[PDB]
Amino acid sequence: MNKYQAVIIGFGKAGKTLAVTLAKAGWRVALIEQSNAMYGGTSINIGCIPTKTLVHDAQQHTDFVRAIQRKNEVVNFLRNKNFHNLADMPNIDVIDGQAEFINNHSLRVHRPEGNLEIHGEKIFINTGAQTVVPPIPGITTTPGVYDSTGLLNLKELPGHLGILGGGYIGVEFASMFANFGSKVTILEAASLFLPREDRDIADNIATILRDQGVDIILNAHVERISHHENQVQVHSEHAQLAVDALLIASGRQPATASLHPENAGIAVNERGATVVDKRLHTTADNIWAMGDVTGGLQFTYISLDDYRIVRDELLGEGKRSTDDRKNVPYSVFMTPPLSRVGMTEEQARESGADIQVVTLPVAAIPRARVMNDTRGVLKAIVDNKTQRMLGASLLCVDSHEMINIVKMVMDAGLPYSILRDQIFTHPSMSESLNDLFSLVK
Amino acid sequence: NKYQAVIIGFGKAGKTLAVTLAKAGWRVALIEQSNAMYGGTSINIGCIPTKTLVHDAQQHTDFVRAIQRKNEVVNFLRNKNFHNLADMPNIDVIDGQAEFINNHSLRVHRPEGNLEIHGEKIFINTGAQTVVPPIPGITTTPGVYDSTGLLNLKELPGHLGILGGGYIGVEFASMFANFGSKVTILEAASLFLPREDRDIADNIATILRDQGVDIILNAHVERISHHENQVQVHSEHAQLAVDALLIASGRQPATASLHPENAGIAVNERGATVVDKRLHTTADNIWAMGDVTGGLQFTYISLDDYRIVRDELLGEGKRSTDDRKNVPYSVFMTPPLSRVGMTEEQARESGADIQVVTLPVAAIPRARVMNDTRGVLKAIVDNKTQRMLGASLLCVDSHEMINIVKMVMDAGLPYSILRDQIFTHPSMSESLNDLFSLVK
Ligand SMILES: Cc1cc2nc3c(=O)[nH]c(=O)nc-3n(C[C@H](O)[C@H](O)[C@H](O)COP(=O)(O)OP(=O)(O)OC[C@H]3O[C@@H](n4cnc5c(N)ncnc54)[C@H](O)[C@@H]3O)c2cc1C
Ligand SMILES: Cc1cc2nc3c(=O)[nH]c(=O)nc-3n(C[C@H](O)[C@H](O)[C@H](O)COP(=O)(O)OP(=O)(O)OC[C@H]3O[C@@H](n4cnc5c(N)ncnc54)[C@H](O)[C@@H]3O)c2cc1C
Ligand SMILES: [Cl-]
Ligand SMILES: [Cu+2]
Ligand SMILES: [Cu+2]
Ligand SMILES: [Cu+2]
Ligand SMILES: [Cu+2]
Ligand SMILES: [Cu+2]
Ligand SMILES: [Cu+2]
Ligand SMILES: [Cu+2]
Ligand SMILES: [Cu+2]
Ligand SMILES: [Cu+2]
Ligand SMILES: [Cu+2]
Ligand SMILES: [Cu+2]
Ligand SMILES: [Cu+2]
Ligand SMILES: [Cu+2]
Ligand SMILES: [Cu+2]
Ligand SMILES: [Cu+2]
Ligand SMILES: [Cu+2]
Ligand SMILES: [Cu+2]
Ligand SMILES: [Cu+2]
Ligand SMILES: [Cu+2]
Ligand SMILES: [Cu+2]
Ligand SMILES: [Cu+2]
Ligand SMILES: [Cu+2]
Ligand SMILES: [Cu+2]
Ligand SMILES: [Cu+2]
Ligand SMILES: [Cu+2]
Ligand SMILES: [Cu+2]
Ligand SMILES: [Cu+2]
């Protein structure tokens, strides 16, 4: 329509949160989304919410197609709620269409009927990531291969599942589909399995997946993909494997090519990420970038923290930055889920500091036996001089909530004794930390 | 023999104290009453067997299969707790019912041989016992059990009757309702969960009533009898018939068979041993940890009782029960209600300027992932201090989020720390980002 004070390109976590925050503050906000099936962002329709809903159903060995529609019931519900939480505000114009830069102030919104041109004093890039297609001849043509999004729309369960890549998201589908009763083949082009984790953990994670029917093929370079008999045929040299479905889990790159950021002076790196400082500023004046287009850690909470820094600049209270980020936690959602904070044993032993590595098997946690899943391990690293914890690797059920307890103490600089001498709930898995830091000597 | 330390009972504090004193070089001797009580009340009757059944109920698993899986996890952990005690050569876990004859010695009435043990320091850990109100017929009526008997039932009852709206009665009411059995709670009070917020108890009630649980307040239970295949609870001008009856009347400390006057410990009213801050006994070299203190009946409190005694015997200085601040608790219904600190009425009565924030669980996306959007989130912030005085977490995995809440109040940090904290996603703990964003 007219000029906007705030224009945000994309319905991601940071964008939709900044939208109401500025609309509540009185700004004339306009959010542009390129697909009417992704209101709410990648987390709700593609990534976190749909996959985690399928995993939980797979934990109970639920029928696959019955669980897929239960995923559609939650996503279609939360997509409409996230759209109406913006559209029902008079200060917000949820414009549909694909945005493209012309100026540092003007944009072109592509819609099939006709284009629009939107102006903004402060524009905010938040377009997320896109699937990385490896340069393997035959993926774009073979009808049986799938992306992460394309896999979450299968009509029924495939018997044999091939995964391209040994990344974190790939292992999530490897454990999810195995729990659905399906032979999963993982294919990573690396010598070690999960090279960014301790081999103690990487081994233990691999034995869990092996017993549920997931074989791990390492240092594999596939050369061509085709369909020869109603099955996706992946063809390596002197090694050929057929699957009823193939999933690409080779990573996600920042989606900026279709945005053409060079016109607004916005610079990008080789992967396509918009260059950004500590205050979420790009090369262009009065234009920000939040989310996976930063090229940083692709987590929903990392994107929401980007909103925190942006909000603390436009609405006052001083200014914060990405430099405030330390001991960032993450978790990979298999069963049992692996949650991680701080450093690894290999990082601590290399540093040279006097450390003490404590290990507690999950089978020694009575609550883990209450939940009928005693698999996993618990490992933590303690600095012997400062008494603080440098890291942890919690491989157990409900590790995604215990990880935030150890993460809180590490940022508070408190010693390991805090978690050891702490009154927890019973029976629980937070109290598992009571026994883990008792092994310290 | 001549033992430097003697612990009466296999409870959580004495189980850990015996293995701790062993690693220090003490001659420890733990006396245990029953053969089926290794590891204590928690392993065999308490938290572990009950919430093992609660996990299986939310899946609506066949009832007789859940009892079997319980009977095999209570068997594993019982064997272990004996192993960790017998693996230490310094410990001699003696079986028998111990009895006090004087300060420095004990007699255990055991069939193998009645035998007298002297100890340098005696640590009472006999736990608690379920006492039952003197209702006529509760003596000898078929189909009437307490928490222990109800755990070993053959097949699921058609209609279960609960005498008591207490926390342990609500756990069994939710657990048995999820198995397909109609539950009837008979509460003698005008209130449902009187120690709870008016906000919280109504949600718990609606959640229970939606699963076919009838919370009958002001229940006049006069006599109990048995007639025609069923237990009949005589009432006011009528009587109601249930297939099985659970007693949820609270547990009294187990200080009776000890005959503890011979040692000289002053027993209070309710039978609990009188105890100071360092858990000291009126006898100079006796101690009492666990439920015999008369305090909160939690397994995690007994472990803290252990830490207090360990800090006294081998620890530097002394640490007291006055350090215990913001003790949390969780009722393991579905969804579990976990709570720390004060409620809205306790905060309003204290005379502080408070603000109440409430986030329904339907707004937590992780609740949809777990297929349980029931419950409510509630916390109270003090405007004078910007701190949190209490939180009511009625949701799935609430027994794990409340520990994050308690540690912030323990270290005593402002509410803005949980509001701006980077939590994992998707998870339940991250709703604290949204809960404390409602504070103005
Ligand atoms: C399979 C999978 C699983 C994941 N699991 C987890 C997990 O368990 N935990 C976790 O923390 N994170 C997880 N993530 C990551 C998480 O989904 C994202 O990193 C997070 O949502 C960040 O999104 P964003 O804020 O960058 O915006 P996004 O939601 O990623 O995207 C912004 C929006 O911009 C739109 N857009 C793109 N290009 C244009 C254009 N040219 N014009 C207009 N609009 C455009 C997109 O359509 C999108 O709606 C997962 C991701 C995937 C793919
Ligand atoms: C149904 C139920 C559910 C519960 N749920 C929870 C929960 O969710 N969370 C929680 O925190 N707590 C819970 N509790 C409470 C918890 O089980 C106990 O309060 C806790 O274990 C107390 O431990 P303790 O240190 O007092 O030792 P106890 O375990 O109570 O010690 C008792 C032991 O002493 C022995 N003994 C007694 N008298 C003698 C004697 N004269 N000679 C020798 N040995 C003797 C007994 O045989 C027994 O082995 C629950 C309790 C029950 C009954
Ligand atoms: Cl990855
Ligand atoms: Cu979200
Ligand atoms: Cu299984
Ligand atoms: Cu609508
Ligand atoms: Cu300008
Ligand atoms: Cu091709
Ligand atoms: Cu096959
Ligand atoms: Cu090649
Ligand atoms: Cu074909
Ligand atoms: Cu060759
Ligand atoms: Cu283009
Ligand atoms: Cu700048
Ligand atoms: Cu870090
Ligand atoms: Cu489970
Ligand atoms: Cu235990
Ligand atoms: Cu249900
Ligand atoms: Cu052993
Ligand atoms: Cu003496
Ligand atoms: Cu006798
Ligand atoms: Cu003698
Ligand atoms: Cu009936
Ligand atoms: Cu009356
Ligand atoms: Cu009759
Ligand atoms: Cu009358
Ligand atoms: Cu009558
Ligand atoms: Cu006697
Ligand atoms: Cu003293
Ligand atoms: Cu579930």
Cα angle: A68, vertex A71, A77; to 5 degrees: 145
Pick the ligand that lies closest to the CA of residue B238. 27
Would an 8 Å CB–CB cutoff place B300 in contact with chain A? Answer: yes
> How far, in Å, CA of A167 to CA of A165, rounded?
6
| Contact yes or no for B178/B60 (Cβ under 8 A) | yes
Nearest CA to ligand 2 atom 15: B298
**Structure tokens that stand for A365 in this block:** 């946690």
Quick one: three-class SS letters along chain B?
Answer: CEEEEEEECCCHHHHHHHHHHHHCCCCEEEEECCCCCCCCHHHHCCHHHHHHHHHHHHCCCCHHHHHHHHHHHHHHHHHHHHHHHHCCCCECCEECEEEEEECCEEEEECCCCCEEEEEEEEEECCCEEECCCCCCCCCCCCCEECHHHHHCCCCCCCEEEEECCCHHHHHHHHHHHHCCCEEEEECCCCCCCCCCCHHHHHHHHHHHHCCCEEEECCCCCCEEEEECCEEEEECCCCEEEECEEEECCCEEECCCCCCHHHCCCCECCCCCECCCCCCECCCCCEEECCHHHCCCCCHHHHHHHHHHHHHHHCCCCCCCHHHCCCCCEEECCCCCEEEEECCHHHHHHHCCCEEEEEEEHHHCHHHHHCCCCCCEEEEEEECCCCEEEEEEEECCCHHHHHHHHHHHHHCCCCCHHHHHCCCCCCCCCCHHHHHHHHCC
Place of tokens 């009949």: B232
Amino acid at A54: L
Cβ–ligand 1 distance for A33 under 6 Å, the answer: yes
Q: Which of A329, A369, A401 sits opposite B400 (nearest CB)?
A: A401
Q: Where are the domains of chain B?
A: 1-440
A53: which chain B residues are within 8 Å (Cβ-Cβ)?
Answer: 368-369
Torsions phi, psi for B157 (to 5 deg): -70, 150
Q: Do B429 and A48 touch (CB under 8 A)?
A: no
**Experimental technique:** X-ray
The CA distances from residue B413 to A388, A409, B298, B389, in Å, are 19, 12, 26, 11
Q: Which of A225, A239, A236, A216 is nearest to A165 (CA)?
A: A216
Cα of B220 vs centre of ligand 26, distance in Å, is 12
Pick the ligand that lies closest to the CA of residue B137. 27
**Number of other CB atoms surrounding residue B100 within 10 Å:** 23
Classify strands B239-242 and B230-234 as parallel, antiparallel or unpaired.
Answer: antiparallel
Q: Which of A17, A91, A12, A7 is nearest to A307 (CA)?
A: A17
Residue of chain B minimizing CA distance to A340: B424
Q: Which of B297, B335, B399, B61 is nearest to B174 (CA)?
A: B335
Torsions phi, psi for B357 (to 5 deg): -120, 140
Cα of B243 vs centre of ligand 4, distance in Å, is 47
| Contact yes or no for B340/B390 (Cβ under 8 A) | yes
Classify strands B159-163 and B182-186 as parallel, antiparallel or unpaired.
Answer: parallel
Cα of B227 vs centre of ligand 25, distance in Å, is 7
Give the position, in ligand 1's atom list, of the atom nearest the Cα of A298.
19
Exposure string of B385-411, with b = 16+ CB inside 10 Å and e = fewer, is eebbbbbbbbbbbbbbbbbbbbbbbbe
